[PDB]
Input
Amino acid sequence: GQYKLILNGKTLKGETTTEAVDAATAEKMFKQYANDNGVDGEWTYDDATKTFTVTE
Output
């Protein structure tokens, strides 16, 4: 399914989407992406909208 990440960092903001087999897989991919881009924030996941957020 399609999962969305809302990036709400101090210096990196926006949205990205990926296909992933499940939310756990999307989470791993999005956390790795956030880490690689210097984002250190708090996370949420909403299963109704398939949306993750990371906020600094």
About this structure: Residues 23 and 49 are 11 Å apart (CA to CA). The first strand starts at residue 2 and ends at 8. Strands lie at 2-8, 13-19, 42-46, 51-55.
